Amino acid sequence: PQITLWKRPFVTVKVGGQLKEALLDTGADNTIFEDINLPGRWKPKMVGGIGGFLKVREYDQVPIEIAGHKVIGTVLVGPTPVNVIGRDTMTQIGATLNF
Amino acid sequence: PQITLWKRPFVTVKVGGQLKEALLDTGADNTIFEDINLPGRWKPKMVGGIGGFLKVREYDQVPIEIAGHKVIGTVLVGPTPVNVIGRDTMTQIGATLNF
Numbered sequence A, B: 001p002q003i004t005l006w007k008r009p010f011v012t013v014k015v016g017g018q019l020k021e022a023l024l025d026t027g028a029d030n031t032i033f034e035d036i037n038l039p040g041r042w043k044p045k046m047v048g049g050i051g052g053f054l055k056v057r058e059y060d061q062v063p064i065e066i067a068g069h070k071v072i073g074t075v076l077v078g079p080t081p082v083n084v085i086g087r088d089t090m091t092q093i094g095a096t097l098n099f
């Protein structure tokens, strides 16, 4: 799809089998969800934003269904106020910004 | 322009007469800069991100030159790690996301 930016750019995704909404966020390097459970091993990462840092678990090779595509990618899980789709996922679906 | 998202999407802007780089951020409602000074009255806001909140000053009717356009908009000023161009500025230049 093509969207304007008058509304927050939420999309519906399926991440590790769970249905979530998340913001298509060109300012986010990484993709981050709250309140999902993913199987297997993970690594700690502390990660930073405008208000400070967020502690997360980093999972590799997580299936994400987004915008008609299925991709496998890294997902961070931790208590973000808003779930975000970052550039690491958006590059996999060829997303572009016109301005 | 049209850009992919392999690179962080920085653009060069002139905001209140000062040259800055800022991330074109579809996850940001508002436009925020650190280390600029703007004239006149402002109102306190506190604003939220990942990891917490940022204290800012809100200025209205600020000049922003961006992507060959000159727009007037609201600018928040405070100690963000990265300057961001939010949807409040990007809508004024007709920006779209293609995914």
Ligand SMILES: CC(C)CN(C[C@@H](O)[C@H](Cc1cc(F)cc(F)c1)NC(=O)O[C@H]1[C@H]2CO[C@H]3OC[C@@H]1[C@H]3C2)S(=O)(=O)c1ccc2nc(NC3CC3)sc2c1
Binding pocket: A025, A026, A027, A028, A029, A030, A031, A032, A047, A048, A049, A050, A080, A081, A082, A084, A086, B023, B025, B026, B027, B028, B029, B030, B031, B032, B047, B048, B049, B050, B051, B082, B084, B086
């Ligand atoms: C600030 C940016 C530079 C980074 N972020 C993305 C922004 O788009 C956020 C998205 C968001 C929107 C929200 F609504 C609430 C939120 F909690 C978060 N926007 C924002 O904070 O917006 C604010 C301000 C702008 O105006 C208004 O709009 C909403 C509010 C409000 C005030 S991030 O989330 O911190 C982030 C994401 C992934 C990531 N991956 C990483 N990689 C690892 C180190 C290797 S570091 C890293 C950092």
Ligand SMILES: [Y+2]
Binding pocket: none
């Ligand atoms: Y590693």
Ligand SMILES: [Y+2]
Binding pocket: A043, A058, A059, A060, A074
């Ligand atoms: Y990893």
Ligand SMILES: [Y+2]
Binding pocket: A058, A074
């Ligand atoms: Y990694």
Ligand SMILES: [Y+2]
Binding pocket: B058, B059, B060, B074
């Ligand atoms: Y205002």
Ligand SMILES: [Y+2]
Binding pocket: B033, B034, B035, B036, B077, B078, B079, B080
């Ligand atoms: Y500042």
